[PDB]
Amino acid sequence: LPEADWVGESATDPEGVIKTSKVTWANRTLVAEEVAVIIPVPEAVIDDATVE
Amino acid sequence: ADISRAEVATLIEEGYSHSLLAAAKQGSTVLSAFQNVNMGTKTTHLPVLAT
């Protein structure tokens, strides 16, 4: 965020100068990563089993 | 000098016939001789009288 300040009123003091201030932004990233598994089984076990 | 059969090369072509290319297939003996039990799983138990 920027900062405001109380200005004062002078042609010649350090105050009476309106101060400069910045605003800034940053970057956040979604990066897609892969999660996986392989589960092997015999065809005859699939055929002989009483469930899917 | 003379023109032999070798002298004319591939002006003479060799033919093809499938008239000897067949074989009658033969099924198993035991699947026609005996009862074919339709199984639904690896092991079937059959009790028998033993004494």
Side-chain angles (χ1 to χ4, degrees):
Chain A
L1 309 185
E3 294 198 331
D5 199 0
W6 305 93
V7 60
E9 189 167 53
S10 177
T12 188
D13 295 284
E15 84 288 4
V17 179
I18 300 168
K19 293 171 183 173
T20 51
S21 189
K22 62 172 66 174
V23 187
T24 87
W25 294 260
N27 165 69
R28 304 298 174 235
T29 54
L30 285 166
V31 182
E33 289 293 332
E34 187 173 305
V35 58
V37 65
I38 290 164
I39 306 174
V41 59
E43 291 188 32
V45 170
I46 288 157
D47 298 337
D48 296 341
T50 55
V51 298
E52 299 297 345
Chain B
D2 59 273
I3 303 181
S4 70
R5 184 172 291 275
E7 252 76 62
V8 305
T10 49
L11 295 177
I12 291 174
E13 299 174 6
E14 300 186 335
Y16 294 92
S17 180
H18 297 332
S19 63
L20 294 176
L21 188 75
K25 310 311 187 305
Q26 298 296 340
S28 79
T29 320
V30 301
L31 295 177
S32 58
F34 302 125
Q35 188 188 8
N36 302 334
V37 173
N38 188 90
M39 302 175 74
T41 182
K42 184 175 179 183
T43 305
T44 290
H45 291 278
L46 306 97
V48 298
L49 185 71
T51 289

